[PDB]
Structure formats: C-alpha cells, structure tokens
C-alpha cells in the first residue's frame, strides 16, 4: 500500500493549488483511490478494475497503455512537452482531464466523485504522512552520508598505499642499477687495463 | 621499463604551468600513478622535453594543447585512456594510431 | 527563513492531532512565529526577542537555558525522557505549554494566539513546504547514491589494479639479478679470452 501527492490546478480557479493524492496497493490496475483537497473542502473516489477495463475498452486503445498514461498525468510524470489540463465541476461533482497537444484537446478520463462529510481527518493525515515521509528520508539521507565518508576515506587510504608501493619501487630500481653501474665500470676498468698491457 | 623513453603529461591541472590548480580526478590521478610506476616520466610542468600527452574525459581543452603544440619545436601525440588500458593488459607497447 | 513543522496532543482535545509550525528568521532567540492548526481553523501568534528576553528575566535564568528548553519543547527535540504537555484555550485563544516531571509541572511558556481569516491559505502553504522538502531531499538522496556506487566501483577496481602491482614488484628485483648476472658474465668472458690471448 502506498500513495503519491501532487499539486493540481483547475482551469475553473488556476489561481487556487489544489491537492490531488493517488493511493494504490500494489499496482494501478486493480485500482486506486484519489482524493481532491483545497484546505476547507475534500472529495474521494475509487477506481476499480471495472471502470478502467470499461473505459479503456470504449476508447478502443490497447490497455497496456492506457495505464501509463493515466500514471503519467496523475503522478505528476508529465514531460516538458506533454501538458495536462484537468476540469472538475462542483455542482455535479464530475472530474475529467484532457492533453493539450498540437493545439487540440483530448478526453482521457471521466470519473465521478463524492464529497467527504470530515474534510479535517483526510487533511490530517496527508500532513502526518508527509512529515512521517520526511523524517525516513532524513535518516537515510544521514546513513548514506555516513557510508560516503567512509568510502571516501577508504578511498584515500588505498590512493596512499599506492603512492607508497610506486615510491619502493623506484627506490629498490634505481638502487640495484646503481649497484650494477659501478660494478660494470669496474669491470670496464680491468678490461681497459689488461687490454694497454697486451697491446705491449 | 616499457615506457623508459615515453615521458606523459596529464591533464589534471584546471590552469597549466601552475601547482595550485591541482584537480581531484579519481580515475586520471591513479592512471598518472600508474604511468609512472610502470617508469614513464611525469612532469608536472609542461616544458619542451614533453612528448605524450593524455587527457581524461574532458574535451574542452583539446583546442588548448592543439594550439599550444603548434609553437612547440615537436608537437605531442592527444591519445585516450584505452591506449594506456590496453598496453597495461597485452604487457606491449599499443600503436597510437588507433589511439589518437 | 527556517521553519519546522511538529505533532501535538492537547488535552483539552486529545482526540485529535494538532500542527505546529515554528518559523524563525536566524536564530530562535531573536524571534518566531506559531501557527496551530488542526485541519479546518488555524491560529497564527508572534513572539519577539523582547518576550523572550522578558521571559527569561522572569525565570531568572540565562538566554541559552531558556532557548534550549524551548527547542526541546516546540520542535520536538524532545530527548529520550521529556514530557511536555500543551493546552489551548480556544474561547480566549491562549496557548500554554508545560513541562511534566512527576507530579510537579512548569509553565514553560504561554502565548496568545489569533485566529486566521483565511484558514485554507496556511494549510494549502504548510502542505506545500512539505512537498518541497520531500522533494529535495529524494533528489539529494539519489544523487548521494549514485556518488556511492560511482566510488565504490573506482575502489574495486584500484584494489586489484594495486594488488597487481604488489605482485610485480616481487618478480621485479629476480628479473634484475638474473639480468646483471648474464652481462657481468659476458664481461668475464671477455676477459677471459684477453687473458688466454696473453698467455702466449
């Protein structure tokens, strides 16, 4: 079970944000609960499978995309260049949503709502479940900076033993060619001697 | 020793010819480190003994060292880090034809 | 501008649940404003630096104590044993908190609120400011992860690139010696054959 708020607004009153919540238990399309708020006043309604599979059968689309759009639109998932213009009229309560494209309208969806008699317990318990949202996003966020600071210690660490590994070797290099340097001159030296020797 | 006489300058540095605008590359400083575990020569500061020349992902400075190579007496080879990869994993020495 | 958004339980009400928002321009010394709400009516207060500073006067204490204790109160930083208790009289608007140890109580604070004209604006704005924070704290979350997994796959990488190294650096110095040894050998050779040369 869980659930996604977004910020509405109607072409009746753009001035006025209103408050558009989606909860579902697993996925969409067994069916979904919205609920409409604008601080004073809420509506609520269901979804079941029925209505969507009788709504995507008239419109003569494949329901497989049917689905997605209905998640683009009202999961806030619209792109910069899909626009979304929602109506929902009072006095009969009726709610329905177009896509503006090209300059031309297109119905999606037409549901009908209820009004709810306790608008206070459904505002109550989206600001409990935005402040319960916000204080787990703040622990994971406080857990995932503790495992980036050690990472990132981590990470220095091994940076260090690198440079030490390329600083040994160097050393031990160029220790054993100097070594051989002299000992080869020497050699040299023998060689040069025994050769103005012979040329007697 | 297979890069004893292959000297490489790397691009870590924002302003070139200059120590305090060292950059925090994760893959190209342990490449550079690599470099000169394997006995290339890195030198910090571009001089006219520089003879390769390896920049990371960022393009924007190639149009730099292409102008700056055109002064030089001997212009330097831009090559990417598949050619070091490469070399390290055959244990030879890759043409930088296929890696310029 | 911070601000912080807390659950109370008043008992004149403790059926219900009721948001308090502190908002604060600096530091809680100089000031903050309170707003209560519960879902349908809104009581909004101020409280300046001069209030404070009086407070504290009469509790006879330091500024930092007092400023502590109402942290610990308002924004819920309440510590593993604290027990605050709120009170709202709603006939003359007063609003009094209280600290509970035992029997024994203390009127911490106690401030004067006034209702709202316009109650849906201030929830319609708390609901708001909670989305944002969700909001940015999930993009900071996700990009705090990607950094993770992006060190996390260099760190694999380096430590076999490193351990490669190390084993190496072993075979290194016996490729060295058995390399010396075929020159300083030929060198001999060489004079050897000098020698025999000159033993005519």
Known sequence: ?200 | SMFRRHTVYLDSYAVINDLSTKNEGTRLAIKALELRFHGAKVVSCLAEGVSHVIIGEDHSRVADFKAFRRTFKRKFKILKESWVTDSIDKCELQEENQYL
Chains 1, 3 share one sequence.
């Not at chain 1, 059968?57 to 009202?74: F, H, I, P, S």
């Open chain 1, 1 to 200: 079970m869980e659930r996604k708020i977004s910020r509405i607004h109607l072409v009746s009153e753009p001035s006025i944000t209103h408050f558009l919540q989606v909860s579902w238990e697993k996925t969409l399309e067994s069916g979904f609960v919205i609920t409409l708020t604008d601080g004073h006043s809420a509506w609520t309604g269901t979804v079941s499978e029925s209505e969507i599979s009788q709504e995507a059968d008239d419109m003569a689309m494949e329901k497989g995309k049917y689905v997605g759009e209905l998640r683009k639109a009202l999961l806030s998932g619209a792109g910069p260049a899909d626009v979304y213009t929602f109506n929902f009229s009072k006095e009969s309560c009726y709610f329905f949503f177009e896509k503006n494209l090209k300059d031309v309208s297109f119905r999606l969806g037409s549901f009908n709502l209820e009004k709810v008699e306790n608008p206070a317990e459904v505002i109550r318990e989206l600001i409990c479940y935005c402040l319960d949202t916000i204080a787990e996003n703040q622990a994971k966020n406080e857990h995932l900076q503790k495992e980036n600071e050690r990472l990132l210690r981590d990470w220095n660490d091994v940076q260090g033993r690198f440079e030490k590994c390329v600083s040994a070797k160097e050393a031990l290099e160029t220790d054993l060619y100097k070594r051989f340097i002299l000992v080869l001159n020497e050699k040299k030296t023998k060689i040069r001697s025994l050769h103005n020797k012979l040329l007697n």
